[PDB]
Design an enzyme around this catalytic site. Structure first.
Site: not given
Lengths: 282, 280
Positions: B141, B146
């Site tokens: 991810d 992030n």
């Protein structure tokens, strides 16, 4: 996606707008085949940019469930969808008052406060939506204030069928079953026995009831998710909401019966609530 | 939940605060065992009130992953956790400047980013992923949102909720990789239900495109529903405006259809190191 003509809606007839998965307001022209030129205000649910494969299939399932359920006064209803050549668009009825949780919290004593009757009516309405949902072999599995929409005329509409399933579409006994249900509204059997039935929905209904009479409080305040089920087995149950009759509280307590079949059925809840509401009016 | 002494942290010494799965700022006292009475500002990840069973298993998996990964300048690090008698608290260093995406969109022409900054920012992350790759751990991810950036503008890869040990992937099962944002996801993760360090290189490429667009949204205008057919037909994003041809070629390499034909993080590091030293 298979072409489903009856539900398909022309994209050029749809004008997106302000936001309200991902849901946005929009003008749908002639969506109502009885005013072909009338632009109707609707709500459109769609994928966000960071969408995952599961997100897509969940939205496709939510939409298909909405097709199978049928129409009912207390159920958010599907107006159509844009499923060909482009983003998937699930077009549903637009509830101007927003979700029930925000709604209730909104009119808390210092807006227009909620009377006891208004609360009882709200509960009676949702019991009808569920009583119907159950007659349709459909289990919601995600009952909670936040998943109820309230119309301009304060009609309660059950929404968020992303997790709803047909009574037979559930792998009883498998570890992965019921893994995506918010535990504070979830029935113990859902987790402990890995099964789900209409009686499981009543348990959730009990929590929704508690939410309503607390005017949108948060279930099991101060109790962590990771410690809940232990307590629930030890018998713990929420306290009678502030201004709530012991009758309505015992009703909740009944929904929170450990033995699924000892909980009332939605039909039964409807009749009791109908009684309470009526005598309130008189 | 197993009792892991090495990481456990007394709840009384922790003081949750303003919000930042669910993350909130906090005051952890003597979390740094060399300063027993000094209170360190940290970030704490916990479940939400409407959490689900999977949310928990997921948070738990996130924690363990960080435990196994080890420390590295470009990976946000685990400081400890509250795992006994009470909610689950995963405590991690606090990145004072938020996530890279917001950070970048912020200083868009509030003090602009220079080319070298972008190149550095890139290199730091490549070192992070190279390390991760060496620890035999796939992130799955990777994306600007992030990535956190500390006060000293140091890049820290974060959000390990979907990271698995290379061998802990259910090769070929339909359900595999069904929770990865498709626009950062590699084709094979979906078309073959597999995931390798090379899939991460693809994501990184997308990350590179984010970085140079200063927070742009990948494949603008192209809906998720019709992305993978384009990808299959050879569609790839265009060169970011203020991006060197060289750097863009690197992105396209990260996006080679054949996984073995995409660069490895070790190579990515070296080239980036080379380009950066020259920019300096």
């Amino acid at each position: 996606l298979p072409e489903d003509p009856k539900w398909e809606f022309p994209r050029d007839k749809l004008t997106l707008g302000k936001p309200l998965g991902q849901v946005v307001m929009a003008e749908a022209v002639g969506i109502d085949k009885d005013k072909p030129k009338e632009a109707v205000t609707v709500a459109v649910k769609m994928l966000k940019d960071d969408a995952t494969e599961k997100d897509l299939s969940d939205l496709v399932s939510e939409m298909e469930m909405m097709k199978m359920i049928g129409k009912h006064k207390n159920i958010i209803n599907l107006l159509g969808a844009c499923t060909q050549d482009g983003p998937l668009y699930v077009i549903v009825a637009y509830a101007s008052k927003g979700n029930l949780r925000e709604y209730l919290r909104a009119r808390r004593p210092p807006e227009e406060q909620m009377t006891f009757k208004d609360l009882v009516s709200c509960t009676y309405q949702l019991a009808r939506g569920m009583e119907y949902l159950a007659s349709q072999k459909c289990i919601h599995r995600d009952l909670a204030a936040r998943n109820v929409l309230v119309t301009e005329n304060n009609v309660m509409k059950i929404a968020d069928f992303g997790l709803a399933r047909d009574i037979n579409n559930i792998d009883y006994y498998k570890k992965t079953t019921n893994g995506r249900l918010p535990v504070k509204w979830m029935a113990p059997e859902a987790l402990f026995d890995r099964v789900y039935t209409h009686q499981s929905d009543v348990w959730s209904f009990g929590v929704l009831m508690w939410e309503i009479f607390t005017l949108g409080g948060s279930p099991y305040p101060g109790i962590p998710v990771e410690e809940l089920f232990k307590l629930l087995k030890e018998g713990h149950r929420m306290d009678k909401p502030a201004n709530c009759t012991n009758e309505l509280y015992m009703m909740m307590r009944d929904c929170w019966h450990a033995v699924p079949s000892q909980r009332p059925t939605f039909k039964q809840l409807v009749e009791d609530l109908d009684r309470i509401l009526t005598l309130t009016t008189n």
